[PDB]
């Protein structure tokens, strides 16, 4: 168990991905499949990654550290954090003045629809706090995935991934033998707009919260910081940013305050 700290310290220092003495199996399982696609023996890879900008092995290592899967309520913790921590913090501050949420890189639609559900169930528990309506804006590359999001249908198999059978029955109409559609009440809370994260965010306006998870890690360091700096814009002061499981923003002169919750961390904009 000694030749792991060498690896994880590498990732944090360079790729900006943090790990843990526990999750050492969901790692050594996934990259060992890629490592078998070569002659690297756990630490010969560490040195061979430093020849970056050559043959993309570095960018491949980034993969399989992340499930290349689209889940419902990914990691489960940021959505509980949203409900019982962030929204109450934000409700007092604002006086329920229509919170805006950004689902940056929404993909198939799953992440923002999960958010829309989280809102509904917060409104259900904390009645009368649901002043106005929260506006969720989900942005992505003009393509089949965003277009699939707008449709808001979903494979019966895709529903088995990260979604409670309660939430399925409650928030979904079955629109087919093998298909499922988002219920209009949940559907209506989000607006999809096509955007490349490399372009200007001025047209989007300001947000109380931003959800950008498992996105920036697939970028470089110089452009990751750039997007982070532009994400600091379009954020109300004291607004929150969700970066997903094991992403770190080690950079930016402060600006973003690291907020440790018990299950994970979020970032507040200073």
Q: Which residues are annotated as a binding site for S-adenosyl-L-methionine?
A: 68, 70, 74, 111, 140, 196-197, 213-214
3-state helix, strand, coil in the chain (%, to 5): 40, 20, 45
Question: 112 near 79, Cβ under 8 Å?
Answer: no
Dihedral over alpha carbons 117, 154, 75, 63 (to 10 degrees) = -150
Distance of CA 245 to the CA centre of its chain: 8
Closest by CA position to 236, among listed 204, 213, 264, 212: 204
What length is written for the chain? Answer: 270
Please give the annotated binding residues, written as ranges.
Answer: 68, 70, 74, 111, 140, 196-197, 213-214
170-190 in b/e form (b: 16+ CB < 10 A) is ebbeeeeeeebebbeebbebb
Q: Answer for the pair 9, 248: CB distance below 8 angstroms, yes or no.
A: no
């Amino acid at each position: 168990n000694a030749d792991f700290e060498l690896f994880r310290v590498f990732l944090e220092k360079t790729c900006g991905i943090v790990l843990g003495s526990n999750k050492q199996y969901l790692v050594s399982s996934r990259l060992n499949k890629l490592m078998e696609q070569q002659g690297i023996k756990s630490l010969g890879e560490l040195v061979q990654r430093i020849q970056t900008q050559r043959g993309g092995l570095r960018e491949m290592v980034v993969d399989a550290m992340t499930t290349n899967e689209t889940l419902w309520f990914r990691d489960t913790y940021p959505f509980e954090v949203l409900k019982q921590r962030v929204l109450p913090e934000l409700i007092k501050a604002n006086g329920g003045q229509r919170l805006r949420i950004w689902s940056a890189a929404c993909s198939s639609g799953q992440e923002p629809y999960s958010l829309s559900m989280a809102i509904d169930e917060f409104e259900k528990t904390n009645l009368g706090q649901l002043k106005a309506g929260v506006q969720i804006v989900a942005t992505d590359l003009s393509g089949s995935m965003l277009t699939a999001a707008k449709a808001g249908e979903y494979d019966t198999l895709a529903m088995g991934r990260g979604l409670s059978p309660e939430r399925l029955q409650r928030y979904f109409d079955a629109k087919g033998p093998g298909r499922w559609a988002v219920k209009p009440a949940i559907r209506s809370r989000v607006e999809f707009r096509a955007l490349n994260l490399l372009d200007s965010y001025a047209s989007l306006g300001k947000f109380d919260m931003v959800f950008c998870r498992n996105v920036l890690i697939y970028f470089s360091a110089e452009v990751k910081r750039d997007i982070l700096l532009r994400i600091h814009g379009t954020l109300k002061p004291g607004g929150y940013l969700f970066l997903g499981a094991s992403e770190a923003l080690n950079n930016l002169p402060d600006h973003y305050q690291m907020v440790q919750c018990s299950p994970g961390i979020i970032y507040r904009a200073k």
